[PDB]
Design a protein around this ligand. Structure first.
Ligand SMILES: CCNc1cc2c(cc1F)CO[B@@-]21O[C@@H]2[C@H](O1)[C@@H](COP(=O)(O)O)O[C@H]2n1cnc2c(N)ncnc21
Length: 250
């Protein structure tokens, strides 16, 4: 039970341009989407980039009616068994593309208040989970906060431009326990120092989940002031209704 978020690829990285030209895929007259898997549609207001893994070969899949999806082959195969693709049981990529080739691309992300978003590398993406595409919400995701900090602190080391990473976080969800940027609060509190502190990050993630859902209040968007508990399914429905998202199961 994930929510897939359709993140429009508006200009592809130079190293990806040769490849897209070759298969006659125009990201301007076609709707090419990176599809992020989330459990938190209510956080979409606070996207600051979209993550892919340097270590994953993604497929570019014909998603029907002029849409194309960039996910792992695993996730598009699953989608083809729940009427989310043109033909049931068909999941041949038009071609494959490695995560690194996409780094630096420009994107539009549904509901994001920040503008000029980029695709950025996340080494800690689990290839077998969701779509392998992970959207970045530094205010409320411990993992996203830790990776962002690490990208901004060592940008030359990661092969990225500093301009690409947003560090000014606009608060999205108010909690009474961890303030207005619960991911920051918890990363500081648990003193998590690397994207690879898996156990501690799982702990932080779990604590942020419970608090955000039961005690979180929206600070932005249509349902500002509302409890996350009440607002979340509405935001999710709006996104689906506007064609910006869809549900899909594992
Ligand atoms: C407290 C968490 N906050 C939070 C979380 C997320 C977002 C905003 C937030 F403010 C946005 O998208 B989420 O991050 C996505 C998803 O929801 C959440 C579901 O994980 P789970 O099943 O609960 O363990 O982790 C991610 N995610 C999706 N795929 C991957 C992956 N392959 N590798 C690593 N992380 C992945």
């Amino acid at each position: 039970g994930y929510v897939g978020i359709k993140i429009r690829l508006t200009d592809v990285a130079p190293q990806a341009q040769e490849l897209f030209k070759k298969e006659s895929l125009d990201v301007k007259e076609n709707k090419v989407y990176l599809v992020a898997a989330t459990l938190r549609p209510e956080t979409m207001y606070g996207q600051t980039c979209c993550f892919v893994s340097p270590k994953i070969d993604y497929g570019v899949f014909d998603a029907g009616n002029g849409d194309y999806f960039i996910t792992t082959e695993r996730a598009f195969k699953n989608m083809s068994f729940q009427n989310l693709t043109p033909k049931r049981g068909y999941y041949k990529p038009l071609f494959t593309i490695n995560g690194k080739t996409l780094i630096g691309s420009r994107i539009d992300a549904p509901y994001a208040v920040n503008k000029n978003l980029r695709v950025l590398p996340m080494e800690t993406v689990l290839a077998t989970k969701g779509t392998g595409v992970v959207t970045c919400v530094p205010s409320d995701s411990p993992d996203d906060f830790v990776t962002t900090r690490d990208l901004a602190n060592k940008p030359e080391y990661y092969g990225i431009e500093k301009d690409w990473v947003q560090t000014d976080i606009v608060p999205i969800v108010h909690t009474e326990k961890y303030g207005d940027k619960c991911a920051e609060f918890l990363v500081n509190d648990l003193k998590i120092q690397s994207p690879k502190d898996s156990v501690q990050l799982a702990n932080a993630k779990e604590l942020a989940y419970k608090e955000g859902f039961y005690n979180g209040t929206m600070l932005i968007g249509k349902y500002k002031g509302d409890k996350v508990e009440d607002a979340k399914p509405k935001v999710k429905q709006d996104l689906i209704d506007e064609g910006l998202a869809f549900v899909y199961n594992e």
